[PDB]
Design a protein around this ligand. Structure first.
Ligand SMILES: NC(=O)C1=CN([C@@H]2O[C@H](COP(=O)(O)OP(=O)(O)OC[C@H]3O[C@@H](n4cnc5c(N)ncnc54)[C@H](OP(=O)(O)O)[C@@H]3O)[C@@H](O)[C@H]2O)C=CC1
Ligand SMILES: [K+]
Ligand SMILES: [K+]
Ligand SMILES: [K+]
Ligand SMILES: [K+]
Ligand SMILES: [K+]
Ligand SMILES: [K+]
Ligand SMILES: [K+]
Ligand SMILES: [K+]
Lengths: 489, 489, 489, 489
């Protein structure tokens, strides 16, 4: 393998798993074996919980500003090591260096930095009842929480989950995707180097159906935060609920609508649509994979999309000039190609792409060309179902209410956006769209201040923003009686 | 039966169920049938959801103050009908008229009154990103939500759940316990009279295993709020999660500790201990059913409890002078009796009652005498398990830290209280107790302003307070891009 | 004297002034003497304060909800007597019944109703410092506060000032404009009748120079809320500050800009411009009295404004069909006529109006015709100074930056607005305008939820919204030390 | 002079004043002239204002996180230079190195650090009105603000004022007391070094006799933040209000009561009393200079107080072992000795101290002995008036209500404290004390999170805590009309 065997991270150091088993992590660009990685056993989970329990106490006993300084130091190290972490994330994900260097660690660290500053701002309430009684609330740490990560933005997700959890005084046990375990382990090292107490951020590697479930089932874990696909999230949430009634946050999939109204500048609209479909090779949960264009503008829009797609630079993710890499894995590629075949079979018109790229060195990896289908219909499989690949579906509409009705006609509801220059239309339409993440005249930006998450089957709870911090604490109400107590007995 | 057959409440009127089936609600004071009540069918649930979908739109389309006024009118009607409703509640629950007339509706309306005034205060956030871009959030209604009630405080719980739900612009379908269906239907009538649009508060009667489950499963319901036992809670939360990923609130059971410190006045202590154990005949989720007393004070304390318990006026709930009624149902009495026997079997010392009361008329009702066990041990079944009856377990401790640790040694975490006159000890101890509802030198008061709910397996989320109003809305983030859009492609 | 002599309102009833002096309130519609009004002496002020001090204790002694119900009761009475109060305001101000019936009491009561619902929501904070210490804050009433009203919206202003003050648990002493004393006295009666404790809302009539100054000087008054001209506002603030360091809030004058952008609908633009200049006969502080029109639209815009101005129904305020009445007083009419002459003298082109209306019975009243000046320059007196009458100044511009700089080029900064259909321009321009009250594609609406007040010379602090309620309490921080205390000595 | 001539700080460097005038700053330990210091001219104030106007634009055009990082960098430098700055502050104030090294810069930077983390948290509101219209608020910088510091904690106060001002995106022109100008100039160098843009923190030297008044009266300054005596505050606020209606925050003087209740540990109570009177040689606004002791304990309390006072280590501030330094200046010494005379003259019993210490070297300094008067009475000049020196007044009382009533009988209201072990009495008592800063069983701690400031003539507005940050922004409300506009004309 390229790297030495990856071990569990428990108690501020690497420790040996006790399962006797390992798995491999593969570079999607060339099929290379990056590392053997240990599978945590059930007993290893137990060890991580007890470690977390004890570390959480040390961490909560500090002052708010002491925690803040430690998380800020972690931010400082992340900025220093951005490029090195990016290179590793590229190996592990297949995503272009041009993305990992500018987005993944940058925005992951942005959120850690945001919450680090907010630690001292976590406050309870005080309410007077009468002269002889008042109540005050405490926002106490939950204690030990678990994060379960997805493979498309490994370290960024580890950061978005751990930042609020640690800032609120918790310990987090994090399980990266079996598909992408490498950067999560580096994060844990960096937390320790920053002065995060032993046990406060532990990492367990392995599968979702095993280690994931052992975490969601454990009676001492008070909250689960999960990122991934909707069907998986239902299982995770059921398990977290029936085991011990955990609090849960779910960031799931979607089939987000992008509505281009007739007064839109078509260049901006095309720029938005491509960015909404082909960043990270189309492997972004919030992608605008149903693009609605007015009948009167279909041809010109298509021409603009085509021009942009034809100049997309698919290639070796190691090459800085690349802006479009392979998919995360061969099995994911096969899934995407199946959707592409479905699109052809159901008679959607292929505007461009539609196949795997195998020329030269690309045969070694899992490269699917940026793909655009048009003349789509709402009942098509590619229009209804999340593909999580570089596959745009263009849909013609005739009026605004129709476009909106159709955009809303889905069990998903993660994101939505509109392109228009009209003041009234922009807000009116966005207010009617049933999604948690709404963009006007742009797409994809997810500022640390902005709470993000899904409506409907696209999520439970939110991430980022002030409010999320609050959801990593639990409220204790304390009523102080200063007067007499009356009994009816 | 005493009353006519109770029908479903859908769309601002009573409609016939389509199950062809009924159940009986039984006066626990005398075993008589109060009414036959229709069971909702699966198609009845579907009917109620479509009704709520349409009503919610009418409700949400009004202004904040319009909703506020309508809810305040409901409050006025409730105050008007306090005694009448208290009478119906007494029949249905067996609870003394002296409780229902002054607690149930009073505090139910209190919470509704609280939220009615807060409708105009529900706000989003605005966050500038840069000169050319900013974000605002909207707190939109979830849409259709469902409440599932417990039998100990039927109309109160229906009010605590429906108030924040409707104030936040939602429609609620509410399912009363099969045990106590009567007052919920009355509430529905009152809401309609008050001007609540048709379909905004619908009531479905029947069993949890059927209608309850049909509600937690339905794809169009966005949130479930449940009150009941932890065991049932787990199944309800699992179902709500895995079906369509609904948001959930769970107000569950407990085994709440009351720690009496040496410096406490033992009169207040005894008053608190008894109030925390025998009000509503011991059928309060937050009851302090593990009472910790210092060894040096056990004797004097037991004497004060006994004296108090011996003057408790058990009797007919219709008699204004009764302050201790029968239990809610015969099967429930049997369950409590079993627990009492377990106490006897496990060699806890009986100090009080410990048997059914059959003297004369009481033989026709489900009466259990106020019961105190002392000399208990943490391993006894009556100490580890929720009884939900008039059964106090007195436990002896030798030091503060020991007491606090043993109080925390439970999977429950609903309530906790201390009795002490020392400034430092009151706050110090309370901060260390793992429960969401904490009382100092008092017990039982639950002001509308105070967020209440459980730690650990005692619940998920909270009710009442400013915070709960927020959790009946979904956050939508809107990024407005006023400037150029950059694409990497 | 159509009405009897008006006395002071102290301690829940009318009482005799000890000044031996009175003044007359007129009726600008004809010349009538509506009534004689007592002048408060310095001793009456002292008396109103002691009354306020004792009433405030009673008011504050109540529960949040108790205060809430009482203020809600007052709202109910105000809705009942809307038309009656309106008729009285119409006599006392000259404002058309059409306005006073639909605006003055309606929106005055809106604000009171908004705040009544919010009483229970006033809360402090809780901040943990460390295991052995935490702090909580209380928001306590200031105590006794004073409101000084303006004459353009007498009862609405009394309501906007008293509502938040009373809701936060204070007593207010209110001083109406000498010009318009009548409706304030009625409001006092209405409060008392609703259950407001004696002394909590007292009314003192007389001059600003005297009783106004006596209020701002009193060492027992904790806060002053003032509405009027900027010149007077300066005097008032200096007095309130230098005497006893009172908290202060001031809503003052303006010369608010309205920018019509070249993409605007001219019908809407003209509607907005006329509404922004001629409602209440041009006696609104927030009026858009500098109207910027793009050169390309000037001719079409002037035509559209003229057509609307010419159909303005000036007339008897008593007639339901009147929508434009006399000014508030003859002296004020003279001031307006002076400004109008200034405009003529400096060679502004007169588009319409420009003189007193004396035909028929109108000659008995203080009627100035709807006046529009065009071809204005920024250094004209009518463009530079607040006229507070029916006089619109139209200013041509060539580009956005120019219009914005000019709009900002003033010591005022109360309000501003833009008319445009472009999403980007609407928000971009509004963000650059230096005013506290900004309207996009509308003008004049002032929701109870919306904080309003001026930038620069146009005011200090705000009215309405959640923020204003907070500013009628004072913050007390309480640090609870539960551990050891350390001295360096 | 020990140092070279001190210049003005404008635009990120030192510049020559244009007054032709200088003043001296004197080491109060030895009468040594530390430095000549230039006096800003009126044209210099103008120059600083124009510099701030331009710097503020650069500062406010950065992102929130950019501002945050720059303030965090200033924090790091302050931590680095803590001892160096402490040494210089000791020279300037005469305060013991043991104080300046552990309090002044530490707690100054604590507040800056606190606010640095909060920059991204400053948000507006969003309020929906109806489907076709909503409002959002912006929290915009005030622009240019002025801070006016006191001489007792020169650099700490400079930090406490500039931190929230800069965090909220303003520029601040700061005027240190002529008595202590040195460290503020260093602070300005440090901000510049951290990356604060030129003009954002400017420092002008001079006195309240000239530059103080030029700052407060300046038309382009939007807010004044002032710390000093109530008498001076009154003048300042009159000027700020009447010149251009500035917002004003004032932290003024006090005569803060410390109530020792009969159940208190007299050792703690004594520790508290001495800490509350002799830290910084009694030069602390919040000092508990009226100490209420119950008659039954007077004797014992005076003994413990005397015992502690006698072991106070008065001496050279340059010596680490010193914990009690000279006063800040010889004129201030004269003022204090005057009050001590008044004490003697009004026949209060002198328990200890009461004179200038002139032994050996101390003769060359401004040392006043730790002084305690007892058997005091409420009409005594030393009891009503702020001395701002080492002069404790002990007062006997008989019952609880009396102590409280007397503690509240003052025009002051800055701080208050109670010592007691009783839960009920602690909260009860503190809730009735009319002060903004209340301590239970401790004294003097002022956490960055705790809003602090005075009731009554002791201050206007607050410093520190979340709420203070909001007060360095101004609210703009924006109503967006998406629907039709309705005109009555
Ligand atoms: O005290 P419990 O915890 O047994 O029940 C309290 C409430 O939840 C309902 N409930 C019980 N089981 C389920 C279930 N499996 N799914 C949904 N709701 C349920 C009850 O139905 P029920 O009407 O049978 O009490 C009742 O209204
Ligand atoms: K991999
Ligand atoms: K959901
Ligand atoms: K029943
Ligand atoms: K839980
Ligand atoms: K009049
Ligand atoms: K101002
Ligand atoms: K000095
Ligand atoms: K004050």
């Amino acid at each position: 393998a390229r790297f030495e065997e990856q071990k569990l991270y428990i108690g501020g150091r690497y420790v040996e798993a006790s399962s006797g088993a390992t798995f491999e992590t593969i570079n999607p660009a060339n099929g290379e074996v990056l590392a053997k990685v240990q599978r945590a056993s059930r007993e290893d989970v137990e060890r991580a919980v007890q470690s977390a329990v004890e570390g959480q106490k040390v961490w909560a006993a500090m002052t708010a500003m002491q925690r803040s300084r430690i998380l800020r130091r972690a931010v400082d190290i992340l900025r220093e090591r951005n490029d090195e972490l990016a290179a590793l994330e590229t190996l592990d994900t297949g995503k272009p260096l041009a993305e990992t260097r500018s987005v993944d660690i940058v925005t992951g660290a942005d959120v850690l930095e945001y919450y680090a500053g907010l630690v001292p701002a976590i406050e309870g309430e005080q309410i007077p009842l009468r002269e002889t009684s008042f109540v005050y609330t405490r926002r106490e740490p939950l204690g030990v929480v678990a994060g379960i990560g997805a493979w498309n933005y490994p370290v960024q997700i580890a950061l978005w989950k751990s930042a609020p959890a640690l800032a609120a005084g918790n310990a987090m046990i994090f399980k990266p995707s079996e598909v992408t375990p490498l950067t999560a382990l580096k994060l844990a090292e960096i937390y320790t180097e920053a002065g995060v107490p032993d046990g406060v951020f532990n990492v367990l590697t392995g599968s979702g159906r095993e280690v994931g479930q052992w975490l969601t089932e454990h009676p001492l874990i008070e909250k689960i935060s999960f990122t991934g696909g909707t069907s998986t999230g239902k299982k995770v949430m059921a398990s977290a609920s029936s085991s011990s009634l955990k609090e849960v946050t779910m960031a799931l999939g979607g089939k987000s609508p992008l509505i281009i109204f007739p007064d839109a500048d078509l260049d901006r609209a095309a720029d938005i649509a491509v960015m909404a479909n082909f960043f990270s090779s189309g492997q972004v949960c919030t992608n605008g994979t149903r693009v609605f264009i007015h009948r009167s503008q279909q041809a010109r829009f298509e021409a603009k999309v085509l021009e942009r797609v034809q100049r997309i630079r698919l290639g070796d993710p190691q090459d800085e000039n690349t802006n479009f890499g392979p998919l995360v894995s061969f099995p994911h590629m096969e899934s995407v190609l199946g959707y592409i075949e479905s699109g052809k079979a159901q008679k959607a018109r292929l505007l461009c792409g539609g196949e795997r790229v195998t020329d030269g060195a690309f045969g070694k990896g899992a490269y699917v060309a940026p793909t655009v289908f048009t003349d789509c219909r709402d009942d098509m499989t590619i229009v209804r179902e999340e593909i999580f690949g570089p596959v745009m579906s263009i849909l013609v509409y005739d009026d605004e209410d129709e476009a909106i009705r159709r955009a809303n006609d889905t069990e998903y509801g993660l994101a939505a956006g509109v392109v228009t220059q009209d003041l009234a239309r922009a807000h009116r339409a966005i207010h009617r769209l049933e999604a948690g993440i709404c963009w006007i005249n742009t797409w994809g930006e997810s500022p640390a201040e902005m709470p993000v998450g899904g409506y409907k089957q696209s999520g439970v709870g939110r991430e980022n923003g002030l409010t999320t911090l609050a959801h990593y604490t639990r409220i204790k109400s304390v009523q102080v009686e200063l007067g007499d107590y009356a009994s009816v007995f």
